[PDB]
Amino acid sequence: TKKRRNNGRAKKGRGHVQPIRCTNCACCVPKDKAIKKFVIRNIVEAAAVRDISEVSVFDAYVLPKLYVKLHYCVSCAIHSKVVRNRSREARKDRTPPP
Amino acid sequence: QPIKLARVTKVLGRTGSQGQCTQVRVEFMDDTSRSIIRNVKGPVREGDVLTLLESEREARRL
Amino acid sequence: PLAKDLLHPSPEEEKRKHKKKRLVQSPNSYFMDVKCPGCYKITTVFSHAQTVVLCVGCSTVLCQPTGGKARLTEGCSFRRKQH
Amino acid sequence: MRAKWRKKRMRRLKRKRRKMRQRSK
Amino acid sequence: VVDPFSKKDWYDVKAPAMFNIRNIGKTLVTRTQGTKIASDGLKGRVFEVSLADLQNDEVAFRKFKLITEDVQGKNCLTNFHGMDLTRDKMCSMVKKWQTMIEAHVDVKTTDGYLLRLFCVGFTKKRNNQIRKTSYAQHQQVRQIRKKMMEIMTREVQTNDLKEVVNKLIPDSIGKDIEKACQSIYPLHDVFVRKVKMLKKPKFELGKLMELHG
Amino acid sequence: SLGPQVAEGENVFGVCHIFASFNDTFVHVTDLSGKETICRVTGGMKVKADRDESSPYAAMLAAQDVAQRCKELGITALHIKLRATGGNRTKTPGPGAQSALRALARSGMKIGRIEDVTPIPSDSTRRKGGRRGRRL
RNA sequence: CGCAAGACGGACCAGAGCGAAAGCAUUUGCCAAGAAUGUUUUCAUUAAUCAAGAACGAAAGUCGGAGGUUCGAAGACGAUCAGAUACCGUCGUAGUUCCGACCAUAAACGAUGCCGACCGGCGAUGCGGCGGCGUUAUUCCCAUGACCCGCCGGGCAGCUUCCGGGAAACCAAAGUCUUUGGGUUCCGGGGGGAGUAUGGUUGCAAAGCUGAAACUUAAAGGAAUUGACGGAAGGGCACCACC
């Protein structure tokens, strides 16, 4: 039976969207189909930044961040627990929780 | 290095694999404004002083 | 609702509809008298001009058209025909 | 049996059935 | 069996005198044993040194690329080769719900130092803009792009290799690109993001000694 | 092994290369240009167990050993250039990035400006794997 | 540090568009369309769907030319294994690439023919045109963008609802259907046998379209519900668990 209204993806008037590869595997999953994450993160997290301010020669130099747009295939997204199975009404919530 | 003696002001919860380590807010006896979050073994109550070995380490918050 | 006046609705409702979908099919266009600084006489210009209008004796250039309603030059003032 | 690999086994054998009709030409 | 660090000439590196901050950082050269010379083993170095170790005191996301070209002795006269932006800055800027516009102009300076300038510009979600999108049309982006090109053509032909690098550290190309493209789509996060060297001419020693004094 | 600068208030800059791949870790301190090198030590040169080459311990020994070797010449400060696996492969640094960078932050080997030198394809060629990829 | 190679066109990039579908994402140019729109210009039923008949049609495959950097059927080897001409790794042939022809098939799916009418609501958006305060933009005031309130036309989807339907899941279309007729094309008739046999036909071949029957069988199936189960996700309880 038709589980989702959109066919597990987000094209509705295309027919073909070029696939961007998986990151955990290398599965050829389509662009809209892929679970996409964009990481905005410090190059040293919280414990190392305590120290490196003393080794920084410059007057309170704020770190560069590290920018990774991840492309997950659906077998990889649920392996790493990025996404997750939801109840029949909870499925349709497109609201990303902070 | 200094060997510091940080007083427990709040117990923030219970952590560990088998649930034994106590996530604790320890206030330094030196400075009563500067504090860290520190994981502690053994039965800890509100109003005792640990013997820290260095304060470079700082326990993670959940 | 149930009882809507498709017989006798308001002008504020009829004029907020498509030119083809009103009580009676009547257009959204008009004729306006574009007067110029070159000569003094009057040319009756269609609103959605989609063409050029030229003055007498190469005095001035009146209109330069766009998609729907036409522009007029800073000076080319229009005086609208009612009939 | 997968409906794809049933279809492939029917094909390999159609290539064979044709070869046992080709020898009489 | 023996230490190959017996033969390292730590020559001090010069930034050109047309900038305030002099010091760069010291670089070993394998000493002149046999044939290969200290001038020979220094004239293939390209130095990644950022903005705030060349110009007095400004922003901290921009960098520059200087070569070695003249070896007098203990003063490495650096000539301008390239410019590249920090990719912490690059990746942070290019977010969703905007139109990134690149334009590359292969254009020749007065003296024969042919560069390749890379413009970059992003659409601003306006002050009272409620619409989530903030996209342009195609014939808005080409009009921006053709004028984005047209200003980088201006700040190469008009002036020398000197008064274009007093336009690489300021916004003295990118601001007129930001200003003169306000009338198409108001773009805000607008730089020129890279310079690349292609055709280095015959080295003039008489030229560079004014740039280093 | 002879630096000409006063030890009072002068700081000589260098560059480092923390190549944190997912099966190895390279700490590589070179000259400013990078065209001539000073010292380089890997996860394998320190530790003789193949599975934990990229580990944050075999990465800790890398920056400790260079700051043991680098101090014999007299480079004060290091510019950071963090490389990933790079190319069509994953752009994340390995488990030996935030340990090796932390390990020469325990030496006090002074820190210049920091950037990613991850060799990212602008528009990538085909990746090694397949249509269906790495099946497990 | 440069040199050569030819692939590919990130993030921007969307439940965004365009194209008959297939498909189409590097900037500058050129050739020829195309909808949507606006129109107090024309023509005056010229139309809708359509056996025969045709154009295009992912990929793989074939044939001849050029190029083979990445990739990877077949093949080789290392493990894992009882065994894996398997999953994993290392190479690697055709292939992947371009030109010239063939091929005419895909879960070519929206598993939903096409033109027309009618029947709820709303927030969005895309394009065009209109109307409506101000803000900034070239200030040198306007023409006008970038926003902004709405309106209208058509498209892409959305959200809600006892419109109504339906076996249900669901769907403003799958609705207006025992209160059964707006038009028109294709097509289904229990499961297998079987897209098989055969003839006909196209193809260089692989194969395509057309396409049975004998015999066989009491089910095959659709949707949903409860349980059991999972080498599914998450939340608990216990010194017959652990610390």
UniProtKB/Swiss-Prot annotation, chain A:
Q: Which family does it belong to?
A: Belongs to the eukaryotic ribosomal protein eS26 family.
Cysteine disulfide links? none
Q: What InterPro entries does the entry give?
A: Ribosomal_eS26, Ribosomal_eS26_CS, Ribosomal_eS26_sf
Q: How does it assemble?
A: Component of the 40S small ribosomal subunit.
State which residue ranges cross the membrane: none
Q: What is this protein called?
A: Small ribosomal subunit protein eS26
As for what it does, the entry says: Component of the small ribosomal subunit. The ribosome is a large ribonucleoprotein complex responsible for the synthesis of proteins in the cell.
Positions with biased composition (Basic and acidic residues): 86-96
Q: Which Pfam families match?
A: Ribosomal_S26e
From Swiss-Prot, chain B:
Q: Which UniProt keywords apply?
A: Acetylation, Cytoplasm, Endoplasmic reticulum, Nucleus, Phosphoprotein, Ribonucleoprotein, Ribosomal protein
Kindly state one GO CC term assigned in the UniProt record. Answer: synapse
Q: Which SUPFAM superfamilies match?
A: Nucleic acid-binding proteins
Q: Where in the cell is it found?
A: Cytoplasm, Cytosol; Cytoplasm; Rough endoplasmic reticulum; Nucleus, Nucleolus
Sorted alphabetically, which PROSITE patterns does this protein's record hold?
RIBOSOMAL_S28E
Keyword Transit peptide in annotation: no
Entry's Gene Ontology BP terms? cytoplasmic translation; maturation of SSU-rRNA; ribosomal small subunit assembly
Is Transferase given among the entry's keywords?
no
Which molecular function GO terms apply here? structural constituent of ribosome
Q: Which Pfam families match?
A: Ribosomal_S28e (PF01200)
Give the Phosphoserine positions (modified residues): 35
Annotated HAMAP family: Ribosomal_eS28
- Relate the protein's function as given in its record: Component of the small ribosomal subunit. The ribosome is a large ribonucleoprotein complex responsible for the synthesis of proteins in the cell. Part of the small subunit (SSU) processome, first precursor of the small eukaryotic ribosomal subunit. During the assembly of the SSU processome in the nucleolus, many ribosome biogenesis factors, an RNA chaperone and ribosomal proteins associate with the nascent pre-rRNA and work in concert to generate RNA folding, modifications, rearrangements and cleavage as well as targeted degradation of pre-ribosomal RNA by the RNA exosome.
**Subunit comment:** Component of the 40S small ribosomal subunit. Part of the small subunit (SSU) processome, composed of more than 70 proteins and the RNA chaperone small nucleolar RNA (snoRNA) U3.
Say which family it is in: Belongs to the eukaryotic ribosomal protein eS28 family.
What is the protein name given in its UniProt record? Small ribosomal subunit protein eS28
Recorded name of the encoding gene: RPS28
UniProtKB/Swiss-Prot annotation, chain C:
Cofactor note (record): Binds 1 zinc ion per subunit.
Q: Indicate, by first and last residue, each region the UniProt record lists as having compositional bias (Basic and acidic residues).
A: 1-15
Q: How does it assemble?
A: Component of the small ribosomal subunit. Part of the small subunit (SSU) processome, composed of more than 70 proteins and the RNA chaperone small nucleolar RNA (snoRNA) U3.
Q: Per the entry, which co-factors are needed? A: Zn(2+)
Compartment(s) of residence = Cytoplasm; Nucleus, Nucleolus
Keywords, comma-separated and alphabetical: Cytoplasm, Metal-binding, Nucleus, Phosphoprotein, Ribonucleoprotein, Ribosomal protein, Zinc, Zinc-finger
Name of encoding gene: RPS27
Q: Could you identify this protein by its name? A: Small ribosomal subunit protein eS27
A Pfam family (short name) is Ribosomal_S27e
Curated annotation (Swiss-Prot), chain F:
Keywords, in A-Z order? Cytoplasm, Isopeptide bond, Nucleus, Phosphoprotein, Ribonucleoprotein, Ribosomal protein, Ubl conjugation
Q: What role is this protein assigned?
A: Component of the small ribosomal subunit. The ribosome is a large ribonucleoprotein complex responsible for the synthesis of proteins in the cell. Part of the small subunit (SSU) processome, first precursor of the small eukaryotic ribosomal subunit. During the assembly of the SSU processome in the nucleolus, many ribosome biogenesis factors, an RNA chaperone and ribosomal proteins associate with the nascent pre-rRNA and work in concert to generate RNA folding, modifications, rearrangements and cleavage as well as targeted degradation of pre-ribosomal RNA by the RNA exosome.
| Subunit architecture | Component of the small ribosomal subunit. Part of the small subunit (SSU) processome, composed of more than 70 proteins and the RNA chaperone small nucleolar RNA (snoRNA) U3.
Annotated localization: Cytoplasm; Nucleus, Nucleolus
| Main localization category | cytoplasm
List, alphabetically, the PROSITE patterns matched: RIBOSOMAL_S11
Identify the PANTHER family for this entry.
40S RIBOSOMAL PROTEIN S14/30S RIBOSOMAL PROTEIN S11 (PTHR11759)
Q: Which SUPFAM superfamilies match?
A: Translational machinery components (SSF53137)
Glycyl lysine isopeptide (Lys-Gly) (interchain with G-Cter in SUMO2) crosslink: positions?
A: 46, 48, 91
Which GO MF terms are attached to this record? structural constituent of ribosome
- Protein name, per record: Small ribosomal subunit protein uS11
According to its UniProt record, what is one Pfam family this protein matches? Ribosomal_S11
Which HAMAP family does this entry report, sorted A to Z? Ribosomal_uS11
Q: What is the lineage of its organism?
A: Eukaryota, Metazoa, Chordata, Craniata, Vertebrata
UniProt similarity note: Belongs to the universal ribosomal protein uS11 family.
Composition-biased stretches, type Basic residues, lie in 127-136
